[PDB]
Structure 1
Amino acid sequence: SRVCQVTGKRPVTGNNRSHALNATKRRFLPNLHSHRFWVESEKRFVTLRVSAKGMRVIDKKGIDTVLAELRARGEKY
């Protein structure tokens, strides 16, 4: 599914509002990308389905910190 493995960001629903204020149901999808992260501690690359926001979270916290959250959640990588 279109779910960020880091933040949990998923498709949300809302409306397209026209100039005439006609509401039509829509979705806002997360900016998802499958990215290979180098994990020094495991001497292996880990491919995660992450939003650009989640990628910034990994830049701040570090991949080991983020992967530890995935283990605690039971979420495999």
Structure 2
Amino acid sequence: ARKCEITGKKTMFGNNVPRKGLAKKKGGAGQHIGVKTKRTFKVNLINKKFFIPNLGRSVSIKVSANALRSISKIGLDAFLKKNCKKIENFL
């Protein structure tokens, strides 16, 4: 699914809320909610390739930009360990 294969992020369902009028913190008399509809917020998965010198080959994973940022911060092996997944589950 649109699911980060590392963390488990998935799309989040919510509303779509139009508003008419001017907020009181802008001098307006207020705002009014219109007709709410249903909508979905989608994770932006990236089909990234990580080259692993440890076995000299590239592994492709579905990760979100957030997980990519965290991998750049901490290191792929440690991040996989923290989320209790192993590189051999991919490939």
Q: Could you tell me the TM-score, scaled by structure 1's length?
A: 0.83
2:10 aligns to what?
10
Aligned: 1:41 with 2:62: no
Runs ≥4 residues deviating over 4 A: none
**Which runs of no fewer than 5 residues in structure 1 stay unpaired?**
none
Paired AA for residue 11 in structure 2: P
Calculate the aligned-residue CA RMSD, in Å.
1.7
**Aligned residue type for 2:89:** K
Separation in 2 of the partners of 1:43 and 1:66? 19
Structure 2 runs not aligned, ≥5 long:
20-32
Structure showing the higher helix proportion among its residues: 1
Which residue is 2:43 aligned to? 30
- Flag the structure with larger Rg: 2
1:12 deviates by 0.6
Letter of the 2:43 counterpart: P
**Distance of 2:78 and 2:58 partners within structure 1:** 15
Is it true that 1:70 corresponds to 2:80 in the alignment?
no
Residue identity over aligned pairs, in percent, reads 36
